[PDB]
Amino acid sequence: SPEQAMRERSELARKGIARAKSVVALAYAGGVLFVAENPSRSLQKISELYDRVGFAAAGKFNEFDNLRRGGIQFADTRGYAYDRRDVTGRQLANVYAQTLGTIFTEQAKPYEVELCVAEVAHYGETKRPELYRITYDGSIADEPHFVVMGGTTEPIANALKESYAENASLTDALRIAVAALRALGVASLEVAVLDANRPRRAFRRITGSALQALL
Amino acid sequence: SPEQAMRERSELARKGIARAKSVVALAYAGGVLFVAENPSRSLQKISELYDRVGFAAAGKFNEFDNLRRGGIQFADTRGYAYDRRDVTGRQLANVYAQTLGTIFTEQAKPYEVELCVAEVAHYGETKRPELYRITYDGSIADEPHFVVMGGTTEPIANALKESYAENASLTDALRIAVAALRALGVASLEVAVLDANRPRRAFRRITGSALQALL
Amino acid sequence: SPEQAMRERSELARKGIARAKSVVALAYAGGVLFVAENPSRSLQKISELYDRVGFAAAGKFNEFDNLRRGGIQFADTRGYAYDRRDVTGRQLANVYAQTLGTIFTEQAKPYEVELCVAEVAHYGETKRPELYRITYDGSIADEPHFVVMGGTTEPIANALKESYAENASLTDALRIAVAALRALGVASLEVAVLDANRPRRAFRRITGSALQALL
Amino acid sequence: SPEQAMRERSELARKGIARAKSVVALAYAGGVLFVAENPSRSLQKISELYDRVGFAAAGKFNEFDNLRRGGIQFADTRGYAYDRRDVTGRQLANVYAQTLGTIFTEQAKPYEVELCVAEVAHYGETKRPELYRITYDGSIADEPHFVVMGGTTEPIANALKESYAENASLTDALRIAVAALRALGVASLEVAVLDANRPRRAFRRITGSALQALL
Amino acid sequence: SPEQAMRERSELARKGIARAKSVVALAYAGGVLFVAENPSRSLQKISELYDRVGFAAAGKFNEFDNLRRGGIQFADTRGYAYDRRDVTGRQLANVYAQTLGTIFTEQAKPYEVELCVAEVAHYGETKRPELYRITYDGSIADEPHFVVMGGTTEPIANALKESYAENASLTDALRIAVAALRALGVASLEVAVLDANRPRRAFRRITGSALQALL
Amino acid sequence: TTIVALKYPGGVVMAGDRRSTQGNMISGRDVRKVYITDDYTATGIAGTAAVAVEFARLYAVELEHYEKLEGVPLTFAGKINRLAIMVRGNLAAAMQGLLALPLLAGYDIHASDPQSAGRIVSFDAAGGWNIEEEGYQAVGSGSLFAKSSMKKLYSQVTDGDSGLRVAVEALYDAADDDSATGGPDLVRGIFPTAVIIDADGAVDVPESRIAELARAIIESRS
Amino acid sequence: TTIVALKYPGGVVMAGDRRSTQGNMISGRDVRKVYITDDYTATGIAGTAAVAVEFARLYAVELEHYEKLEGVPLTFAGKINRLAIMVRGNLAAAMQGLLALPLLAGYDIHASDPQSAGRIVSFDAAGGWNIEEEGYQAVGSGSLFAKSSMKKLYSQVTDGDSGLRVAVEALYDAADDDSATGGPDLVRGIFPTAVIIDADGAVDVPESRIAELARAIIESRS
Amino acid sequence: TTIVALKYPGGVVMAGDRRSTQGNMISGRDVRKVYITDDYTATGIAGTAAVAVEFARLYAVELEHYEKLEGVPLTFAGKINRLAIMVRGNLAAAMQGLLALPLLAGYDIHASDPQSAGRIVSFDAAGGWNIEEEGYQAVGSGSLFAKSSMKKLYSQVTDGDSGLRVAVEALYDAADDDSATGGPDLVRGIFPTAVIIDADGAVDVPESRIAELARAIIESRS
Amino acid sequence: TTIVALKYPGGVVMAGDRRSTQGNMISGRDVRKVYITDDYTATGIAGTAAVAVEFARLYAVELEHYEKLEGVPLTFAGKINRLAIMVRGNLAAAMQGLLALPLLAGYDIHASDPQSAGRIVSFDAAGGWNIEEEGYQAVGSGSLFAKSSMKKLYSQVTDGDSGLRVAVEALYDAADDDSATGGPDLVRGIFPTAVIIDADGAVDVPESRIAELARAIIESRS
């Protein structure tokens, strides 16, 4: 019975997502902020896909690391084939949707992952940041303000809705993100920004003493 | 059992298309009008296949985006191999029917999509726009007046049947389609036209202040 | 059913690892110390992957020996393609995680192994040694202090937690490691070190009269 | 259930070994002695792999004959590619472990074979002979004194344990092996030696009048 | 279950061989004699493999004819690759054992065949004829005196054991074989000889008037 | 063959001659060598006529295909890269004789300043591309004569009409010095083709305007 | 074409001319041949212009691709090896006619001495590389004249300003003895492009400073 | 180079010189060209030294591989066929200069008559082989002189010692008439290598016996 | 280029020059051509510099790869075979100008007599190898002069320092007779590189000791 097979496959992927650390991506005045509860300093859940395109993921590390490498390969190949400015976050989101749908339907075990692709404007251009969420089955959604992935996302989402404010500063937005995650310290936090003020590469990791001085 | 397996596969696809937003394609005096309920400005259910051939779809986005790319590739290759005026809506509808039939009977899960292919006459020619409706299993139908896809189609189909006007202007046709979908503002509404009065490329997106003024 | 099948594979692999000898990999002042109870003098659970990268494993010998050979091939190819100092323990741990996840999901029998990849700093550099534990399903974790694999790892983990001394000497670390492992003698014991004070290749086997003197 | 598949596969292979003739390999002053119960002078269970490497097997003849041919091919390729003295019994035993593990897991029916690879020291050198036992599932063990094969090995192994003499003469070792095997004349006996005193090729078959005088 | 599958497969093969005509291959003073009860004068159960090697089979004709053609091809290729005197009966028997083992384990239906490979000495050499019996599952055995295949072989084997005579004449051996094979007429008999007195090709058919006189 | 392109304040103009010759023999007299690739770029290909037509069709198909697939057209740099890839993929045919030199005129709508948004891109045989900052370029056999004519006439380019006149005059000079370039045929009434690209898009100049300009030039040269 | 690179206490400077010729005909006057490959390495490729641009783009893409995948940039030896592999892979085309000889200047942030962190790597035709210990290296058709000018001028290099002046003068000498190298165009206002790499990173030298240096050199040699 | 082989009553003997040249320059003085392929066969390969060693190693590996796989050694005709197949499969590479010509000496253990069990097999360029019935054979650059010397000396061969003496004298004559063959070098004490195969197997001749024979021959010709 | 290797009581020494030329132009003055391949083997490649470096890297990677995989290092015969196979595989590209001529020096740690455990292995172009018993060998364009110098100075070799002195003197003679081999640069302070292998392993000789030896040689010949 294919209906029961898909239902239990979806249950497996969703349950795998439920017991994973949460990630929040939000739009602030300077671009996009990623905050994740990541104890390790070596296994990074937030990465740069391309100049103005950033990647966040929740779930099983090897699976979304495979997806991250595939997306980086796609972005670099596309930017070389046509131009760097021709790479948008929407194309990468669509590629992730195709890949995750095919994986969910055909692979022996579905990927218990949940991805967010975030894009900021180019240097000297005005555009609201774009947040795309891609789920295990390949369902793709547009989020105007924030994305919450992994764990019990309802309390974190509710805290964000009660405490989100567009055009916030980096410091304040970080405070809201950490407070919503709690519902941690400089350790067990991985924080990065897509910084729209940079000329070419918007991705910037905020770690260590700078993160504490910003927290 | 084969009959049982095929029937459960069919019910899976039908229930997938049932929980999806509706699209209408109806022929008006200047060509064809596509109206869909689509909150996302980046994920577009209505697209162009070729100069006078337009595309609409309802269901899982990744699946019909893959189908749309396949159709665009087929149309471009065929137009290059013979000529631009040798590409017609009927051939694209037939290739979609073949592809969806093969997907239904062969793929691990069938595509939960319903497609519409619309064609208008070339510039300076009089011909009734052709509407083709294609379902998850590959069944293809010729509709003379309007096509309704996705969601609950019975009430909106009855509303259109009672209220459809032949050779209506764009404003009246848009009003009829929006009221049928209501049975929705500029946001959460994707509207496009195959405009038979254009010289080469008929497809044209009605968005922003233009849709607000026209609506 | 995929969930029942995945659980049964997990039980198979876990039972296989549980009936195996224990391995301890712990960081000390000179680098990383590997101690594994190994009666055979030829079949070795501890080996060198690359200049400053060492390998420990627990479980079925032929499976983790295949993994060890694959890791050595990957490291040598990577070092030739770019440079020797571009090969890190993190990349090898990531490759092992990917490989073990794929084997767990797809192969006829999942690998009944647990791996530790250890790295120490290059010569004339300060850096805490990194220990990565990879499980049978590809789950990868960073352990800052020590790793225990195989058998009943819980009493050994508790003993090592109670008795672990940062920046201990080689002989002290051997004492604590062997004591936690007993919870044996020089024979039926394989001991190796990644020695940070070596010029190029850190790995070095401590067996025989030297091991007895040290133990 | 994968557990049930693996356990009944193990039952199949072990039962196949159980209804098989017994083999004995033991280390003595001149090298290694192989004694097998073989009524056929044509079909051989004892064989030579390489200059100082000999092969013994118990179980279904065609399966371990295929294994023996593969091992001879591997040893010849390895010797030609590097040098004759770069071929060891450990490499051949590891190859057999990988091959038998893959056969046991992946093939339709496992192999009902049990292998022993024996190596003696090169000419003019001193080294204890090495004996490696490989089982049907790929498990490999280093047996320091003797290996016993096929049939019910508990009484034969117990008699060998009670009566084994290190550094015995060829006559003494042959008598001991035959006596332990009983718990046999020139017929129904295949006898060979890895003879450590031969210059290059250590394998030598002991049949006919020489075996009569020796027995 | 692999055990159940193999047991019922063995039942199928044995049932197939039991409902077949019987063949006897027995050694006599001039070489080897093949006698089969076979009404067809067109389809032959006994053939020549090589100069001094002969083939006999019982069971389903298409399967053992495929095996006979494959063995002829192997023998000719081996003789051309090295020499005509390097082809032996044992090599052909080993090839048949490998082929039948693979067929029994892997093919959808096992071959319901029972093969005998017979070899006589070369011209001018006195060597005992060697007979190999290969069963459906790849088991291979040395028969020193005679092989009985197909049908209910117990009475024929008993009669042969009671009435055998080493170094018997051709007429005595033929009469004894026919008498045991009844336990009928000259027609419905296929008789052939591997005649060690021939210079190069030992195989020689005995049919018609010569067979009438010989019996 | 000669195809010239030049920038004027507010856009670009691309003009091309009409003659096709096989050897010394005039085979075609109304060949159209300038193509409106998309709404804001035009391309002119010199060399083999067959390769020219085939490449123009392929390039237009590629640009339209990208726009339809991705929902947004390529940037100007993307279009240049695609054209350069096409040129680099023709080296074997160039050595075989199926050669093509493209020239690309465009209007960057994403350019910050509208009055400098015109672009001219020249490609060499090896596939390299160059954005011209001198304001004009030419390809074909008479490209040298046309370029040296534009070098002297470019000072009087101020708007679209004067730029069109200067392009037609450069084509006239190229035809005057190169027998493979056809001049204005006043007997058959065949004149060079031209495309003007500005902020409103790329439009083909009507044959009447070029006829008037060519007649004025011929009257001046007598 | 000529690209010079030289080390000064605290960094490296790489400069290049602007001319591109097709035989004897000057096609380009403002070609940029020095590329900031990444924040601490610049590369300059002489030979065919198409192959030079393609190599620069492909090499920068490779370096950034590795850094994004592994979360850490390549070591300097790894960058040298990747460039050498590209040079070795281009050998068939180089025999065919698409020759590209690169020159790499970098700052080794992992060096023991920041003042000696400047690195110059020249690549031979076969892909082999060499870290120059002379402190100066030039590639291109005028490279011999530039190298023999720097051999005499290098004692004057004590900081970034003196090093940049010496690089510009070496380019001037190469253009003086070589016709394929473009000298300072005082009429069109086109000057060599320079990149300076130090601890803070690699930065393009503004056109005005190079113009001032070139005018000073020209007036000194008048 | 020169390798001679000759049959004596009760077996075969096979001798080879020690020199390897690269042109007219001597590069090797103690090259071993006669190999004991198995207990009853020796092979000696003339031509390129690298290919000679490669062929000998491959041939021994192949023979031992068959003996281990099938449990019985190849018949002599089988060994000849394998060597001929190797020579035939090296034809294309020998057309480029990696030529190798083998000579096979053996003792057939299946021959009815022990006194005539020695066999000499010569292989020509295209892979054909002949079993020599005249009782002697030679390969290499000095092969013709050695053959013509053995033609005159073969009536003196009655046992292993006289056969060895005649083989050494044939090598001496080949070295006397051909500069690519090394003669007995009394200064360094390097003498031709020899292998004697009889019913007991194939055994290398100790260097002392060959030295004595070479000294006797040199004295006789002095 | 010239690389010399020579055996001395208790080990082996291997020295090489530093000059690299392309045609007649001196392109490199501090090249290193002797590589410590492993703890008891040094390798030195003459010929194309790029191929030499990549062959040294491949050989070191292969030996360490085997040692890591099989837990035990290769025997000396295995190392020789791997190097010979690498040379044979290169043969085809070597015909194309990418020649590499290796010379291998080693200490046989499994040899019965450690005083005679040093090994020198030479390779010809076809991929064959020879273990030199004369005690010295040379590769490179100046290898003939170096060999003929060592033939006259090998009597002096009695220990490691005497062997090193003869090696530097052989290189001095090679550079004295050959313009592609560099003599000791007393002006720049660049001297031949050397590696000494004994029971304790293979160590790079410090530059100061070779400088003293070279200055003593120069004073001797003044």
Curated annotation (Swiss-Prot), chains A, B, C, D, E:
Major localization listed first in the record, in broad terms: cytoplasm
CDD domains to which the protein is assigned, alphabetical: proteasome_protease_HslV
UniProt feature coiled coil, ranges: none
InterPro entries cross-referenced by the UniProt entry: Ntn_hydrolases_N (IPR029055), Proteasome_alpha (IPR050115), Proteasome_alpha-type (IPR023332), Proteasome_asu_bac (IPR022296), Proteasome_sua/b (IPR001353)
Subcellular location: Cytoplasm
Gene3D superfamilies: Glutamine Phosphoribosylpyrophosphate, subunit 1, domain 1 (3.60.20.10)
GO biological process, one term: proteasomal protein catabolic process
GO molecular-function term, one example from the UniProt record: threonine-type endopeptidase activity
SUPFAM superfamilies registered for this protein in UniProt: N-terminal nucleophile aminohydrolases (Ntn hydrolases)
Pathway given in the UniProt record: Protein degradation; proteasomal Pup-dependent pathway
Domain of life: Bacteria
Regulation: The formation of the proteasomal ATPase ARC-20S proteasome complex, likely via the docking of the C-termini of ARC into the intersubunit pockets in the alpha-rings, may trigger opening of the gate for substrate entry. Interconversion between the open-gate and close-gate conformations leads to a dynamic regulation of the 20S proteasome proteolysis activity.
One Pfam family hit: Proteasome
Function statement: Component of the proteasome core, a large protease complex with broad specificity involved in protein degradation.
HAMAP family: Proteasome_A_B
Entry protein name: Proteasome subunit alpha
